Write a protein that binds this ligand. Structure first.
Ligand code: KQO
Ligand code: ZN
Ligand code: ZN
Ligand code: ZN
Length: 443
């Protein structure tokens, strides 16, 4: 071997299908049917008798048709063979990708000896199509890095890899309360964008940061107009050097707020919510020693980022949702911004049901309960906010199914055994992710 290391992939967490958002973690017992429908033991034993309705229509399958197993299968890492010396090498170690170098793998010893070099990887992060937004962000990050003069830092590339039109539909409880009486729009149009930051470490790209956002333009009816909502943020903690990692995250996030403020978006919204254990927002299979922040520390992290943005004159100010509503003299749930997949649409469904039909009953109490978790970020304030021209985004749409939401990228990593759990594995996953973004765009 190369490293002389016996390497195998770790078992990944699956879903249990018999409960919304349930999972089966490493080294857990589970029941599976056709390697497709998996059940945690609890979700299995809570099924009535021996009849499970399956599908994705209904197919009643008996319970004795399942296999009982433990989630502990260890797939060995793959090797590749040098087409000349026949040396066997971990594919991840040498980062050989059949699509980048179709003519076969040639080890570095055979390359140095013959004074040869690998043909250039034209499937790099750098060569992903650029945008006004991505350029604005990466200029900000690289200018910051060069101001720091740290010998270990590498060039950072920021790329927007998806942009498409969407709408968020008001859920049935709030629909029956406010939409059917005509007090609230039934849906809100927005544009979603996915963007990623890469760092060149030793001429090798590493994806270390990802973001999905929802941008509601000047055409959106209230209460959603001229607002951006950050759907998901994620990172892989291998940015080099470690002591600039947080500042780089801040530069990206503050730069994005600066950018949308320039286009005319008045307000930013952040739900400071950690993932639960074993759940990946964007990047599949995080490093074990990269810890999920607990809520209070995630909140303070966002507070520090926003405070720097305020002192930079980018953010005017920010408040929690409870304080924001009080100053806005809010009286009804219909006045709250209604975002896709956000907490408040879900809690308002439950609030209306438990109150027997009111849409204002526990509103302020619920906002006070959770206020520390919801940031309302004022970008454009006072009289300037009233006379704004239409929002015209210079960047075009970018159709890319792999990056339409977070799910397709998690599925690709699952299907191709990609992990972001170590530097070597995250570099390999970055290479495969880059190849996929380049080939999908070719179509
Ligand atoms: C105080 O400390 C922090 C460490 C990282 C962050 C950020 C961040 O990345 N995250 C916040 C959420 F927590 C999701 C993601 C995260 O930790 N995601 C992880 C991390 C480890 C994981 N293991 N398993 C899953 C899993 N998800 C860094 C990039 C910009 C967003 C804020 C913020 C604070
Ligand atoms: Zn190796
Ligand atoms: Zn379960
Ligand atoms: Zn060789």
């Amino acid at each position: 071997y190369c490293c002389g290391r016996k390497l195998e992939f770790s078992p990944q967490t699956l879903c249990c299908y018999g409960k919304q958002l349930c999972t089966i973690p490493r080294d857990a017992t589970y029941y599976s049917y056709q390697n497709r429908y998996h059940f945690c033991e609890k979700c299995f034993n809570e099924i009535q008798g021996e009849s499970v309705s399956l599908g994705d229509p209904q197919t009643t399958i008996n319970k004795e048709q399942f296999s009982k197993r433990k989630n502990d299968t260890l797939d060995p890492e793959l090797f590749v063979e040098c087409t000349e010396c026949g040396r066997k090498m971990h594919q991840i170690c040498v980062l050989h990708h059949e699509i980048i170098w179709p003519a076969g793998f040639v080890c570095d010893g055979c390359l140095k000896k013959s004074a040869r070099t690998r043909k250039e990887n034209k499937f790099s992060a750098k060569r992903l199509p650029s945008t006004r937004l991505g350029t604005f962000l990466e200029n900000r990050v690289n200018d910051f890095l060069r101001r720091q003069n740290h010998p270990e830092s590498g060039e950072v590339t920021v790329r927007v890899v998806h942009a498409s039109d969407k709408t968020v539909e008001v859920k049935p409880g709030m629909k029956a309360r406010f939409v059917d009486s005509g007090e609230m729009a039934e849906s809100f149009p927005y544009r979603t964008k996915a963007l990623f930051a890469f760092e060149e470490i030793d001429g090798v790209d590493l994806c270390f940061f990802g973001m999905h956002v929802q941008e509601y333009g000047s055409d959106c009816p209230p209460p959603n107009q001229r607002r951006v909502y950050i759907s998901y943020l994620d990172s892989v903690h291998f940015f080099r050097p470690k002591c600039l990692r947080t500042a780089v995250y801040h530069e990206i996030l503050i730069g994005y707020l600066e950018y949308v403020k320039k286009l005319g978006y008045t307000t930013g919204h952040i739900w400071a919510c950690p993932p639960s254990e074993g759940d990946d927002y964007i990047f599949h299979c995080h490093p074990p020693d990269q810890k999920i922040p607990k809520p209070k520390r995630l909140q303070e992290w966002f507070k520090k980022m926003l405070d720097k943005a305020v002192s930079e004159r980018i953010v005017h100010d920010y408040k929690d949702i409870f304080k924001q509503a009080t100053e806005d003299r809010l009286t009804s749930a219909k006045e709250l911004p209604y975002f896709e997949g956000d907490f408040w649409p879900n809690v308002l469904e439950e609030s209306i049901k438990e109150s027997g039909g009111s849409g204002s009953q526990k509103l302020y109490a619920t906002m006070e309960k959770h206020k520390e978790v919801f940031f309302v970020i004022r970008l454009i304030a006072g009289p300037a906010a009233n006379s704004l021209p239409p929002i015209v985004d210079p960047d075009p749409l970018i159709p890319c199914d792999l990056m339409d939401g977070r799910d397709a990228f998690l599925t690709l990593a699952r299907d191709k055994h990609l992990e972001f759990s170590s530097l070597r594995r995250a570099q390999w996953s970055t290479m495969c992710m880059l190849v996929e973004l380049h080939t999908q765009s070719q179509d």
